[PDB]
Amino acid sequence: PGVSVRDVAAQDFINAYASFLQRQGKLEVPGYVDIVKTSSGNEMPPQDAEGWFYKRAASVARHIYMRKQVGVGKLNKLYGGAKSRGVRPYKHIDASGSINRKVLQALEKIGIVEISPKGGRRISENGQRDLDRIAAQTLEEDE
Amino acid sequence: AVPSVQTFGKKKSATAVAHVKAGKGLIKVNGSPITLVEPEILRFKVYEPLLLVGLDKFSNIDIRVRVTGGGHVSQVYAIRQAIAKGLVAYHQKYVDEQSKNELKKAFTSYDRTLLIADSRRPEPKKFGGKGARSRFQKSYR
Amino acid sequence: LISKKRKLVADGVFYAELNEFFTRELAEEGYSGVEVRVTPTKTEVIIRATRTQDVLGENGRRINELTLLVQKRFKYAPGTIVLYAERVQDRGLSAVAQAESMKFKLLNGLAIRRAAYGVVRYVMESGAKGCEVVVSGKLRAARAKAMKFADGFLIHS
Amino acid sequence: IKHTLDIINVLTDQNPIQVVVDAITNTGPREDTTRVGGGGAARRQAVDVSPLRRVNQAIALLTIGAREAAFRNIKTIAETLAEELINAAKGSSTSYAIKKKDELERVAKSNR
Amino acid sequence: GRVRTKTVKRASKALIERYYPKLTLDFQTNKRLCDEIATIQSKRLRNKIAGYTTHLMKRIQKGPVRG
Amino acid sequence: SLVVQEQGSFQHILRLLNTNVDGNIKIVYALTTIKGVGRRYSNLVCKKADVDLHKRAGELTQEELERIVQIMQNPTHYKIPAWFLNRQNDITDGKDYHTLANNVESKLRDDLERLKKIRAHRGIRHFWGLRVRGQHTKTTGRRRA
Amino acid sequence: IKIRITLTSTKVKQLENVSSNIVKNAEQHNLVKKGPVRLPTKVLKISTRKTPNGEGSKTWETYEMRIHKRYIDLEAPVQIVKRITQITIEPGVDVEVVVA
Amino acid sequence: ENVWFSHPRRYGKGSRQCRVCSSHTGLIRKYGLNICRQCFREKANDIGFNKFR
Amino acid sequence: AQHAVILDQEKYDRILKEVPTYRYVSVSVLVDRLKIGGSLARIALRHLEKEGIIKPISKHSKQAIYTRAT
RNA sequence: UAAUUGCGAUAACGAACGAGACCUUAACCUACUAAAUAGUGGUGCUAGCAUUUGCUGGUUAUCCACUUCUUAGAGGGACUAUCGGUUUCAAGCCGAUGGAAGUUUGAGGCAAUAACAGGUCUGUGAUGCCCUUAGACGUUCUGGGCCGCACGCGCGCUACACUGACGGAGCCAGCGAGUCUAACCUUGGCCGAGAGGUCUUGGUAAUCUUGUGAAACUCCGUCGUGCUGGGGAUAGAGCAUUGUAAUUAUUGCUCUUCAACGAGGAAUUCCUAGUAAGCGCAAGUCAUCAGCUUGCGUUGAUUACGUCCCUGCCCUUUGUACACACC
Ligand SMILES: [Mg+2]
Ligand SMILES: [Mg+2]
Ligand SMILES: [Mg+2]
Ligand SMILES: [Mg+2]
Ligand SMILES: [Mg+2]
Ligand SMILES: [Mg+2]
Ligand SMILES: [Mg+2]
Ligand SMILES: [Mg+2]
Ligand SMILES: [Mg+2]
Ligand SMILES: [Mg+2]
Ligand SMILES: [Mg+2]
Ligand SMILES: [Mg+2]
Ligand SMILES: [Mg+2]
Ligand SMILES: [Mg+2]
Ligand SMILES: [Mg+2]
Ligand SMILES: [Mg+2]
Ligand SMILES: [Mg+2]
Ligand SMILES: [Mg+2]
Ligand SMILES: [Zn+2]
């Protein structure tokens, strides 16, 4: 009957595609991984130390699949959160731009996304086909 | 052409627009199936339009809902209202009045907000206090 | 190249400044208001007053100097701004004209009650439904107070 | 609430909704007292309680007991509400709401 | 409260005094004739006047009314 | 889902950098008790020392603890990016340090003493016992001592 | 020819009668037109303290100016274009005509 | 002298004033009107700002 | 409170002998009746579910509900 | 009756102001007029997964059609309608039904007479008198101060943790504002842990920023009753941005330091439903700086549906040695 990413729940799809990318092992994880926090509004680095870049990659790949074209500033706003400003009230703070820009470049190098006209990154046809194949596998795993 | 109706449901700022056409039984919300609506503690709140009348009513039609505005729970309420109103409007236009009245009676007997929008609106905030009613703290000394 | 919000606020403040200028200089001419009409290639300023002959002067000399004044101040090109004078009707039904006439009577030395009853009688004779004039301040004493003079009926809310 | 009903059905094989309504019926306070003038000193006069107030005050006592016993505790709020409703449904007197109801009725009986 | 003021009451009595056989015991028709037979500046005030007129017609049908 | 049987090799109190580091708590939040070692620095040092971060502090090997303290004492050698360091571009040597257990109080005393001996306004403020960061002192900090 | 006429007043009735006589002149001349698109009314608010000094109850006061905007698309030759831009002059109604 | 009035008035309250009364304080700068709040309450009806709600 | 944070032989065979005869098993149940930490309780819950001694009822985060398997 | 709102009574009759009416706003309209600056469907072109035909998308010069959703203009609609109780059986009130809506439908705006020796001469080129007026109390320049800290008060903000913190995911608003002789709101690309830098771009704006992808919230984990991974005051070091200038730290960022606080005594504030409370956002101020304010939406309870006990207010009667009037 055919499936797509929209037929699969977001969490288990993202987990399955992140595990697939980690097993494939050609994503070029930048190297300052295990140093950084992913946001100025965060206070601790990601707890899943050896992963989390495949998680962010699967998340941004699925996000670009659903949208038309997404850029780094939209990604920074999407992943930014409430910063605790000590004794002053909380506030929305954008996430790290270097992490999102490098994961966009990594997805471009493995061929999932591409540069779009009207700016930003849109999903490529290869990205569409293998995200759809991952959706098929993770919807079949329960059978 | 294909028999079809368009309806909507509302709750606060959330609006859901539903296209109900003749089909084979797919219920989609924002392009995803009805079984993936985000607060799963509230998933039965959009299941209950289907459940009160039975799925045989939905076997021969298919419904696509796009919801915007508001927040998470209000979008859930707008989705259920749009789906129920779409089924009633389809049975009004292309099926008979007996079936339309039975659907309307079942939905009304369970929950009036399945068909009639909740009319509660925000009250504007007034100066001299944080909210519409609440005032700043008064001190005397 | 200006936004519509700023343009409409700007011509509102232009109207307010022009009205203040005209009520500052044309007080003894019975100046009763101003109206502005923008037109392709020309904007026209209609002064509504009582003594149009004093507003104009000989061959409209005061009109020419008023056009030149508003031109020099508001940076208009030659020919783009034009002023007309117009005799207002129903002078009794003009609160600004009545207030200015009462002001000049009090400055000349009329008694307060005589001036106020003159203006209320003139307004009531002019066909108004009601008139009310209030004079506040140091009236015949160092302690200030307020005097009210009314005729007819007036609503408030 | 969903977790609480699951825990109730696990701990006792009863219908958890039946356990909830038994808790409410058992811990509604049947007589109370109200303040009067009393000539410059507070006196309390025993009065009866309407059934709607019994339901309201039963719910308030049950949830206040659960919230207080869950505060600063390894037990979760769902667990604390589960044993609160179970003990109130038994009338076991280890329930906060049962003890509060008994204390209020005893004070009213003294102040008849 | 739903107490109607003397403008509504006086207009209703005048309307009944000079238009009794023309107007009916139904609010919709009383509204539709009141808007053309009287000059009322507000739709709300016209509705209130027509409603009190209909109420007084029911009163008149159940025996005579003083005033 | 993985339970393990620990033996008698667990220790409850262990001694690093003249500090009684408690066992029984996980290694990064255990190492935060060393003064000059916070949560970010301890997390990064444990990652660079390649220990299981899930492990409690008391059940780690002596070589693992020595590797941890060696990395803490020389962070720039083990590729700590130098903006983690709490004493960088220091006023005397010019090099980036990360002060540790007693050195943090020693260097704080050094900094305050330098400010006092040149009679800078911050040093005079520290000598008096007042707030030095420009806060209003009219209403707060009344029982500050 | 692709002309667009934009009307941006604060006076609703004068705006509507200017729009009405433009569109009836267009249908009298049998010109194909996109009808008067009415943009969202933009409300300009200014909130101030009522008092000139600063004592008493803190009473606030919001003033607002409402801007109403409409536009009509016309496909008409140039002589009717000049006659349209020469007719329909109204005080308080700001009219502008643009081509292409 | 060139020392007179030499201090910059490019930003802050010393750069702006009420266009009516030349007051530095209480200025409303919204929509570029630059009128102090008291003068604005006097001339709001002339400008076009009205009270409705 | 001095809840055990690593487990040894007596704690292991104790939990293996009396996580049965518990009607309701959860993190706080294990913490209260066996004096182990919450982390050991979560690990032990997953382990006992994987062998199958306790049967899950609902397996939410922040609240785990297990019964005995018979 | 919310109301000197009315039914009525009646040495008064007829009126006027206030109240109400009114006006603005929020709710309804598959009825009208329309829309390439709002959307939807179909047809072109095209991607992926499937296999007759399907599903999810991309592309507006690719055209056509429509107006449900959106925006206005013009209108309609509620008048307590109908029915049943109750009341001299009048004005009205109570319940149920229908209805988008039935506490004057909700919220405002406007708002009388008489007054206070209320506040304001530091908003005003509004002002009388008094003072000063050239080593001026005018004005400008430089540097300080308005922030100074033994203490005592009033608004508030963060919290004392598991109904939580942290980490990954999920992922949704409404009100608004924005650059011309200027340099505003800024997408996208690149560099940087970050703050930020840089190259461009769209937008004088229902078009662009902006779906303002907000936060609380959800879901999986980590922690685990330990002032603890609660809390983040006070400090140290370094990197940036605004600005002529940041030293008494302008703010932002990074690492380190890690204090009180274990739910708060007498007292005392506010509040009746989309309200309280939680949660953030825009705007004002504004070169930079929100723990403030004015609005806006998101999540959404409990408990009244009363009374005159306290504190007050209105009307009538009554007493008074009060009239600057019980201070
Ligand atoms: Mg997040
Ligand atoms: Mg908070
Ligand atoms: Mg609130
Ligand atoms: Mg607890
Ligand atoms: Mg298409
Ligand atoms: Mg009746
Ligand atoms: Mg009202
Ligand atoms: Mg003054
Ligand atoms: Mg000050
Ligand atoms: Mg205050
Ligand atoms: Mg913390
Ligand atoms: Mg979280
Ligand atoms: Mg929006
Ligand atoms: Mg400042
Ligand atoms: Mg601000
Ligand atoms: Mg302020
Ligand atoms: Mg006596
Ligand atoms: Mg006396
Ligand atoms: Zn001014």
> What 3-state DSSP class applies to G43?
strand
Phi then psi for C45, rounded to 5 degrees?
A: -120, 110
In chain C, residues with a C-beta closer than 8 Å to the C-beta of H35 are 13
Q: What DSSP string describes I6-56?
A: S--HHHHHHHHHHSTT-SSB-HHHHHHHH-B-HHHHHHHHHHHHHHTSEEE
Direct distance between the N- and C-terminal alpha carbons of chain F, in angstroms, rounded to an integer: 51
| Alpha helix (H) residue ranges in chain B | 43-53, 72-93, 97-110
How many other C-beta atoms are found inside a 10 Å radius of the C-beta of residue G49? 17
Alpha carbon distances (Å) from A25 to A105, F8, I16: 15, 40, 40
Q: Which amino acid is at H49?
A: F
Identify the DSSP state of B21.
E
Hey, is I3 helix, strand or coil? Answer: coil
Distance CA(I52)–CA(I49), nearest Å, equals: 5
Element (H, E) at D19: helix D16-27
Angle C65-C71-C75 from CA coordinates, rounded to 5°: 160
Longest dimension (CA), chain G: 65
**CA I46 to each of CA A47, F6, I21, I51, I64: distance values in angstroms, whole numbers, following the listed order:** 20, 19, 18, 9, 10
Nearest to B7 by CA among B122, B72, B91: B91
CA angle A109, A111, A114 (to 5 degrees): 90
B12-50: b (≥16 Cβ within 10 Å) or e: bebbbbbbbbebeeebbbbebebebbeeeebeebbbbbb
* Rounded-to-integer distance, Cα C62 and Cα D78, Å: 89
The closest CB to that of H51, out of G10, G52, G63, belongs to G63
Q: Does the residue I2 lie in any domain?
A: no
Residue C66: count of CB within 10 angstroms of its CB = 22
| CB burial string H24-53: b at 16+ within 10 A, e below | eebbbebbebbbbbbbbbbbbeebbbeeee
Which residues 57-86 of G interface with strand J at a CB distance below 7 A? 58, 60-62, 68-69, 71
Rg (CA), chain I: 11
Residues C11 and G92: their CA atoms lie apart, in Å, by 10
| H47 has binding-site annotation | no
| Closest residue, by C-alpha, to the C1' of J271 | B134
Cα B132 from Cα B71, distance rounded (Å): 21
Strand J: which bases are under 7 Å from protein Cβ? 1-3, 5-8, 16-28, 30, 33-37, 40-41, 47-50, 54-60, 68-74, 76-82, 90-93, 100-102, 104, 106-115, 117-121, 123-126, 140-142, 147-159, 161-180, 186-196, 204-206, 210-211, 213-226, 228-229, 231-239, 243-244, 247-250, 252-258, 269-281, 283-288, 290-300, 302-304, 309
How many structural domains are present in chain C?
2
Query: F69 to chain I nearest CA, in Å?
Result: 24
Q: Specify which residues B62 forms β-bridges with.
A: B21
How many CB atoms neighbour CB D27 within 10 A? 29
Which residues lie closer than 8 Å to D74 by C-beta, 6 or more apart? I27, I28, I31, I32, I38
Q: Count the Cβ atoms, other than its own, within 10 Å of residue I20.
A: 13
Put simply, the answer to whether C9 touches H46 (Cβ < 8 Å) is no
C125 lies in the same domain as C155:
yes
Domain that holds residue C74: 12-86
List the domain boundaries for chain E.
6-61
Is the minimum distance from the CB of A19 to strand J below 7 Å? Answer: no
Q: Return the CATH number at H7.
A: 4.10.830.10
Chain B partners within 8 Å of A6 (Cβ): 31-32
d(CA E67, CA F7): 106
Residue nearest to nucleotide J243 (CA to C1'): H11
Q: How far is the CA of D91 from the centre of ligand 13 (A)?
A: 54
The contacts of residue C47 (CB under 8 Å, 6+ apart) are C22, C26, C31, C33, C34, C55, C83, C84, C85, C86
Phi, psi of C114, deg, nearest 5: -65, -45
Per DSSP, what are the bridge partners of residue D48? D31
Are H20 and H35 spatial neighbours (Cβ–Cβ below 8 Å)? yes
Q: Which of residues 32-51 of A touch strand J (CB under 7 A)?
A: 32, 35-40, 42-48
Q: Do C109 and C68 share a structural domain?
A: no
Q: Find chain G residues with C-beta within 8 A of B127's C-beta.
A: 58-60
- Neighbouring CB atoms inside 10 A of G67's CB total 20
F81 touches chain A (CB under 8 A): yes
* Nearest-angstrom CA–CA distance, E39 and E32: 12
DSSP classification of residue F145 = -
Q: Which of G69, G18, G19 is nearest to G43 (CA)?
A: G69
Residue tagged 């356990």 (tokens): D19
Structure tokens at G70: 């409409």
CATH number at residue I35: 1.10.10.10
Neighboring chain I residues of D78 at a CB cutoff of 8 Å: 63
Three-state SS for C19?
helix
Q: Provide the terminal-to-terminal Cα distance of chain E, rounded to the nearest Å.
A: 24
Q: Which of C84, C149, C89, C81 is nearest to C121 (CA)?
A: C149
Q: Which domain holds residue H8?
A: 1-53
Total number of domains constituting chain I:
1
- Contact in structure between F3 and I43 (CB atoms under 8 Å): yes
Determination technique for this entry = cryo-EM
Q: Residues D100, D23: contact at Cβ < 8 Å? A: no
How far: A81 CA to J269 C1' (Å)? 34
Q: How crowded is residue F30: how many other Cβ atoms within 10 Å of its Cβ?
A: 22
Q: How far apart are CA B29 and CA B51, in angstroms?
A: 17
> Of the bound ligands, which one is closest to the alpha carbon of residue B15?
13
**Phi, psi (deg, nearest 5) at residue A30:** -60, -35
> Which pair of structure tokens corresponds to residue F36?
């000059």
Phi, psi of C151 (to 5 degrees): -150, 150
Which CATH number belongs to the domain containing residue C115 in this structure? 3.30.1140.32
CA distances for A67 relative to A62, A70, A95, B71, angstroms: 9, 7, 20, 20
Compute the nearest-CA separation of A35 from chain F (Å).
Answer: 7
Cβ of I57 within 8 Å of Cβ of D75? The answer is: no
CA-to-CA dists, residue A50 to A15, A26, A53, A55, angstroms: 14, 15, 8, 11
- B128, B135 contact by CB (below 8 A): yes
Å between CA of A120 and C1' of J237: 40
Burial (CB < 10 A; 0-12, 13-18, 19+), residue A121, is buried
Alpha helices in chain A (DSSP H): 10-24, 53-66, 72-79, 97-110, 125-140
Question: Does residue C6 fall inside a structural domain?
Answer: no
Q: How far off is chain H from C35, nearest CA to CA, in Å?
A: 11
Q: Can you tell me the distance from the alpha carbon of B79 to that of A86, in angstroms, rounded to the nearest whole number?
A: 40
Q: In whole angstroms, what is the distance from residue A78 CA to residue A63 CA? A: 10
The radius of gyration of chain D's CA atoms, rounded to the nearest angstrom, is: 16
| Nearest-nucleotide field for B12 (CA, C1') | J274
Q: How many CA atoms lie within 13 A of E50 on its CB side?
A: 23
Q: What is the rounded distance in angstroms from the CA atom of residue D65 to the CA atom of residue D81?
A: 8
The strand J neighbours among A residues 96-125, by Cβ under 7 Å, are 96-99, 101-102, 104-105, 115, 118-121, 125
Three-state SS for F85?
coil
Q: What is chain C's length?
A: 157
Looking at the CA of E55, name the nearest ligand: 6
- Distance between CA atoms of residues E45 and E39, nearest Å: 11
Structure tokens at C70: 């508003």
Non-local (6+) Cβ contacts of F77 within 8 A are: F71
Structural tokens at position B37: 């609506």
Name the residue closest to J268, CA to C1': B139
User: N- to C-terminal Cα distance for chain H?
Assistant: 55
- Contact of F29 with F39, CB cutoff 8 Å: yes
> Which structural domains are found in chain G, ordered by start?
1-90 (3.30.70.600)
Please tell me whether residues C28 and C52 are part of one structural domain.
yes
- What domains are there in chain B, each with its CATH number? 1-127 (3.30.230.10)
**Pick from B79, B17, B29: which is nearest to A7 by CA?**
B29
Whether C3 has its CB under 8 Å from any CB of chain G: the answer is: no
Q: F42-57 b/e with 16+ CB inside 10 Å = b? A: bbbbbbbbebeeeebb
Superfamily of domain E6-61: Ribosomal protein S17 (1.10.60.20)
Phi then psi for residue B65, to 5 deg, are -120, 130
From first CA to last CA, the distance across chain B in angstroms is 77
SS (H, E, C) chain E: CCCCCHHHHHHHHHHHHHHCCCCCCCHHHHHHHHHHHCCCCCHHHHHHHHHHHHHHHHHHHCCCCCC
CA distance A124 to F109: 60
**Alpha-carbon D84 to chain mean position:** 9
Q: How many domains does chain H have?
A: 1
- The pocket of ion ligand 1, defined by CB under 5 A, consists of A 81
Q: How many CB atoms lie within 10 A of CB G23?
A: 16
Q: Residue I5 has which token pair?
A: 């944070």
Q: Beta C81-87 vs C42-49: how paired, if at all?
A: parallel
User: Closest Cα partner for F36 from F59, F56, F19?
Assistant: F19
How crowded is residue F143: how many other Cβ atoms within 10 Å of its Cβ? 4
* Residue C65 and residue C103 in one domain: no
Task: Indicate the DSSP class of residue B127.
Answer: T
Please tell me what resolution, in angstroms, this structure has: 2.4
Domain that holds residue I46: 7-69
CA pair distance G8, G41, nearest whole angstrom: 10
DSSP structure string for G4-34: EEEEEES-HHHHHHHHHHHHHHHHHTT--EE
The candidate with the shortest Cα–Cα distance to F24, out of C143, H1, I37, is I37
Question: Looking at the complex, does the CB of residue G14 fall below 8 Å from at least one CB of chain C?
Answer: no
Element (H, E) at D80: helix D77-90
- Cα torsion angle, C62, C66, C71, C73, sign: positive
How many angstroms is it from G63 CA to the middle of ligand 7?
A: 20
Judge if the beta carbon of D70 is closer than 7 A to nucleic acid strand J: yes
